[PDB]
Amino acid sequence: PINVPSGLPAVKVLAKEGIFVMTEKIRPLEILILNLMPDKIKTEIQLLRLLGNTPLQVNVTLLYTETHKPKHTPIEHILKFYTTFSAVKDRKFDGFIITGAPVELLPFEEVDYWEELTEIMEWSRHNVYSTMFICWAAQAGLYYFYGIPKYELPQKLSGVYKHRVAKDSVLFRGHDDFFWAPHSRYTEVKKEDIDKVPELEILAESDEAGVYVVANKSERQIFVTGHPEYDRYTLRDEYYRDIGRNLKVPIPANYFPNDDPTKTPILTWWSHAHLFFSNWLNYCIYQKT
Amino acid sequence: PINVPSGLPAVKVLAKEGIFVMTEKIRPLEILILNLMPDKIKTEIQLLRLLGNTPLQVNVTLLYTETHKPKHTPIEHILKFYTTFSAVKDRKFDGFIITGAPVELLPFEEVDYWEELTEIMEWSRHNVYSTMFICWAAQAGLYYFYGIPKYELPQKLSGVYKHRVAKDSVLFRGHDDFFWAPHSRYTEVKKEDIDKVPELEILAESDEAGVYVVANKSERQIFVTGHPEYDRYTLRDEYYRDIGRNLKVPIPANYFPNDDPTKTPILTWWSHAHLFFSNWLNYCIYQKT
């Protein structure tokens, strides 16, 4: 069902979970991913897992900035699998995901590649049917399209938080009254700013985590502040990493049994993640363009 | 997406939840429903809700026994919308749902229409790709195909119960470690009987509710002992009904806030229900026949 570049690590990883990606030649959906994460291989796997759960054919195209300051991912992988804005200016896509980045703490305009991002964002307004913006990207987009500013939090929001649906959307078909989603970020946007923009609507939120999903009335722009796509272990690995660097930090919230980091975490947000991305593909894209 | 008979009440009901059924003329999936419930209109709505959540086209055919002893549903509705085994012997279907019935307390062979049911069940072995059997039907089928007997429970199992996945299946893609499903029945089948039949596998179970989902190795037969398709209110209406008949009975388990029947119930099993029926349609049927 989902099609991806030939040697992508995700193929063999996902193959282990019954998810058989492919690498060969109604029409398939064209889904673009602008991967801004530091661990690009992990994020690929997490997103591809959810784009594949479906009977629709998806073709995935992996995009990067021409500005590369080497973070985690090695240069070879980006060179092999990733393309630039220039090679896709001229195409149109049914969907587009712009992922998080570890960049919350700078003003938007003082990010290396804000100007590139801006051109791409603007382009997606016209060449992508529905664009989804995750984590810091939600903030970048809410800011660039609607003037919605971000704010530093007293401390880091890191854990799994409980949410409710604030406004009906097809995106939340199949949801229970309450669901869980991970958040991991040092900044936030606010109901009170968003509330001043009629084009925007708050679809889900959390008392602990705040605004979670906001969207256009047409749902051609969807802003997600958390990380529904994270693995059971994602937060744990981050925790063990920081602790191993002798940094003192909070145990992620509502994640570890009894808040015990040796005791393995309980997976509570898979259902939401899967429903959410299926609905996007089926309801926000396939049945609309 | 989902197609159904012209005047079905479900059309207008589901239309209220954005689910636009249809009534006109890859090919559509042919899904047969043998509705044995006493409230046939309710069950239609509950099942159609979950068969429709999908990008695949489904055509639904509503089947009944030629034996009718009038329960709840009026004769006019059955006469208008329902057809008999004879009119469908000759067709083949991709999927088939056989629903519950209020019949647990009789031996199988002393049910009015066991012999009709038996002929239909046998037929589905050959003319239906994947057959799903719910509530009492799970028991009828487990019994008829594998010799698996049912047992009376000390008291009635009535509530929402927590479950785990016991064996991996595509049916449970997107599930959390633990999920909820309603059960409402006076009888049960047992791990210990099922365990003696290699063709069977237990896919989900509950410590409180017991065996929940069992299946063929090919998943061409799926047995569900609970009612994932129930509305928020289904258990409440049953409760108010029985209490109004001055019958003393248990408050349904894990359903009412604080076990208070005026306080409205919290919907906790929608996610599971939706994932489960999507997976059936996508993974157990569409990608196989």
GROMACS .gro file of C-alpha atoms in nm, chain A residues 17-19 26 52-56 173-178 232 265-271 274-275 279 282-283 286-287, chain B residues 17-19 26 52-56 173-178 232 265-271 274-275 279 282-283 286-287:
model
   60
   17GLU     CA    1   0.524  -0.565   1.215
   18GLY     CA    2   0.340  -0.705   0.910
   19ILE     CA    3   0.355  -0.363   0.747
   26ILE     CA    4  -0.839   0.576  -0.849
   52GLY     CA    5   0.035   0.271   0.587
   53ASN     CA    6  -0.252   0.159   0.810
   54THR     CA    7  -0.513   0.195   0.535
   55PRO     CA    8  -0.641   0.035   0.213
   56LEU     CA    9  -0.541   0.340   0.005
  173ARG     CA   10  -1.418   0.979   1.420
  174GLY     CA   11  -1.390   0.664   1.639
  175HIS     CA   12  -1.254   0.847   1.940
  176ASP     CA   13  -1.353   0.784   2.298
  177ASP     CA   14  -1.451   1.070   2.527
  178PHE     CA   15  -1.086   1.093   2.642
  232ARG     CA   16   0.629   0.320   2.338
  265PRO     CA   17   0.588   0.203   2.982
  266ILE     CA   18   0.228   0.125   2.903
  267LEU     CA   19   0.119   0.207   2.546
  268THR     CA   20  -0.195   0.421   2.572
  269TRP     CA   21  -0.191   0.651   2.265
  270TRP     CA   22  -0.163   0.406   1.976
  271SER     CA   23  -0.540   0.396   1.928
  274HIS     CA   24  -0.395   0.531   1.429
  275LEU     CA   25  -0.749   0.665   1.411
  279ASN     CA   26  -0.911   0.977   0.924
  282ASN     CA   27  -0.957   0.893   0.429
  283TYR     CA   28  -1.169   1.196   0.530
  286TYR     CA   29  -0.920   1.102  -0.021
  287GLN     CA   30  -1.285   1.208  -0.008
  306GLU     CA   31  -2.310   1.203   1.242
  307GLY     CA   32  -2.161   1.297   0.902
  308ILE     CA   33  -2.191   0.935   0.792
  315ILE     CA   34  -1.168  -0.231  -0.774
  341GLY     CA   35  -1.885   0.282   0.690
  342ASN     CA   36  -1.577   0.423   0.862
  343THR     CA   37  -1.346   0.346   0.569
  344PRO     CA   38  -1.255   0.458   0.216
  345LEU     CA   39  -1.374   0.126   0.066
  462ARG     CA   40  -0.346  -0.311   1.454
  463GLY     CA   41  -0.352   0.032   1.628
  464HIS     CA   42  -0.454  -0.105   1.965
  465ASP     CA   43  -0.317   0.007   2.298
  466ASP     CA   44  -0.194  -0.244   2.554
  467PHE     CA   45  -0.544  -0.248   2.709
  521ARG     CA   46  -2.287   0.488   2.484
  554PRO     CA   47  -2.179   0.694   3.096
  555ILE     CA   48  -1.830   0.758   2.969
  556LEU     CA   49  -1.759   0.625   2.618
  557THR     CA   50  -1.443   0.414   2.640
  558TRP     CA   51  -1.478   0.143   2.371
  559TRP     CA   52  -1.538   0.344   2.055
  560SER     CA   53  -1.169   0.345   1.966
  563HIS     CA   54  -1.365   0.141   1.510
  564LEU     CA   55  -1.014   0.003   1.473
  568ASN     CA   56  -0.903  -0.376   1.020
  571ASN     CA   57  -0.911  -0.364   0.516
  572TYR     CA   58  -0.686  -0.651   0.637
  575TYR     CA   59  -0.994  -0.634   0.108
  576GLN     CA   60  -0.629  -0.741   0.096
   0.00000   0.00000   0.00000
